Amino acid sequence: GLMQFTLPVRLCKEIELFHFDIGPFENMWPGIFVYMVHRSCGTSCFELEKLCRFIMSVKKNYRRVPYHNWKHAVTVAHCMYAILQNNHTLFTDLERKGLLIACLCHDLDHRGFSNSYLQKFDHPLAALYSTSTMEQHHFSQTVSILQLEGHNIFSTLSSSEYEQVLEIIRKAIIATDLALYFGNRKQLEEMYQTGSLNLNNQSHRDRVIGLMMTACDLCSVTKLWPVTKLTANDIYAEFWAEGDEMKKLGIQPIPMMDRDKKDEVPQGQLGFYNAVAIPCYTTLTQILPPTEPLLKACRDNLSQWEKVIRGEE
Ligand SMILES: Cn1ncc(C(=O)Nc2ccn3cc(-c4ccccc4)nc3n2)c1C(=O)N1CCC1
Numbered sequence: 001g002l003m004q005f006t007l008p009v010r011l012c013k014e015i016e017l018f019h020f021d022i023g024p025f026e027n028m029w030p031g032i033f034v035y036m037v038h039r040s041c042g043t044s045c046f047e048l049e050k051l052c053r054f055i056m057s058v059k060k061n062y063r064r065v066p067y068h069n070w071k072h073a074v075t076v077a078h079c080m081y082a083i084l085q086n087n088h089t090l091f092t093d094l095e096r097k098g099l100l101i102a103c104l105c106h107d108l109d110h111r112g113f114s115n116s117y118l119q120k121f122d123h124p125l126a127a128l129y130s131t132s133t134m135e136q137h138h139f140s141q142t143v144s145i146l147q148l149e150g151h152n153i154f155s156t157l158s159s160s161e162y163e164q165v166l167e168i169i170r171k172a173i174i175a176t177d178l179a180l181y182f183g184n185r186k187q188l189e190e191m192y193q194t195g196s197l198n199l200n201n202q203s204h205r206d207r208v209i210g211l212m213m214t215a216c217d218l219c220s221v222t223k224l225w226p227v228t229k230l231t232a233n234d235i236y237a238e239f240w241a242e243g244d245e246m247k248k249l250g251i252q253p254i255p256m257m258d259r260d261k262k263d264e265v266p267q268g269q270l271g272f273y274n275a276v277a278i279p280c281y282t283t284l285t286q287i288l289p290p291t292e293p294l295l296k297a298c299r300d301n302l303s304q305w306e307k308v309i310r311g312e313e
């Protein structure tokens with residue numbers, strides 16, 4: 001009960017900042033997550049025995065893929081932690097509990113392939129879940145882990161609080177489907193500008209939590225340039241593997257996934273920052289002003305990709 005996690009001084013300070021990198025020491029990541037739950041949620045939110053056993057079962061069910069791995073889960077949970085800490089009074093006790101767990105679980109059992117590859121491969125998951133294929137699977141896997149004996153970190157919630165938290169986690173994980181992001185942000189953009197955005201309207205909170213989930217999911221683009229640049233390698237390593245597997249099905253993949261068109265990566269990243277990342281953190285910054293450092297880091301990194309193209313790096 002009186003057992004805090006404490007981090008070394010450098011981590012204790014940097015962890016509060018949006019651009020924190022969780023480091024290459026895998027065995028520190030669980031403690032970093034528990035640290036973040038204790039400060040964000042309270043030391044009483046979860047039985048430490050059950051949290052520790054939930055965390056390690058979640059770790060076991062991430063695969064050794066170049067990008068959609070246990071490191072990504074913890075990275076995405078830290079971005080959510082930074083947003084929650086910088087927006088203290090905007091979120092219910094239940095939302096803080098649910099969203100850190102949602103981020104940790106949001107890519108459970110990822111195979112390193114897109115929903116489109118599952119559909120063209122004709123994977124059994126594509127027959128079980130026609131849209132948001134992997135994301136419905138990630139929530140499925142989350143519920144399964146929660147139902148393992150001794151792994152139910154929500155056991156001390158009332159029946160209705162339990163149903164609400166699982167509903168927050170389900171919508172949160174589904175929103176990480178980037179196909180749903182475009183319409184979600186357009187709607188949030190209209191609502192913000194016409195002044196109809198109401199955080200007491202549950203349907204409105206849902207859209208805002210969805211944008212937060214997209215923002216955390218993409219948070220690789222908000223780190224310092226050397227972290228962003230080296231993460232890009234992991235991202236493209238998966239894309240090019242998928243491109244190879246498209247060619248094995250007799251389908252020319254999109255250039256993003258074709259390892260023969262590496263040359264075009266700098267222009268492809270430009271399109272992604274302008275079409276997805278900048279709009280995402282701009283709308284987020286309008287709704288939640290203290291998230292501005294994420295938009296600022298994203299712009300710095302846009303400018304770094306512009307420098308790569310101009311041959312300057
Ligand atoms: C992980 N994640 N999740 C979704 C996406 C995504 O769609 N990104 C893209 C989108 C469009 N592109 C096209 C080309 C491309 C490359 C070479 C040649 C021709 C075209 N490169 C692109 N990359 C990403 C991503 O890139 N990152 C960075 C942070 C998340």
Ligand SMILES: [Mg+2]
Pocket residue numbers: 106107134176177
């Ligand atoms: Mg995903």
Ligand SMILES: [Zn+2]
Pocket residue numbers: 072076106107176217
């Ligand atoms: Zn993800």
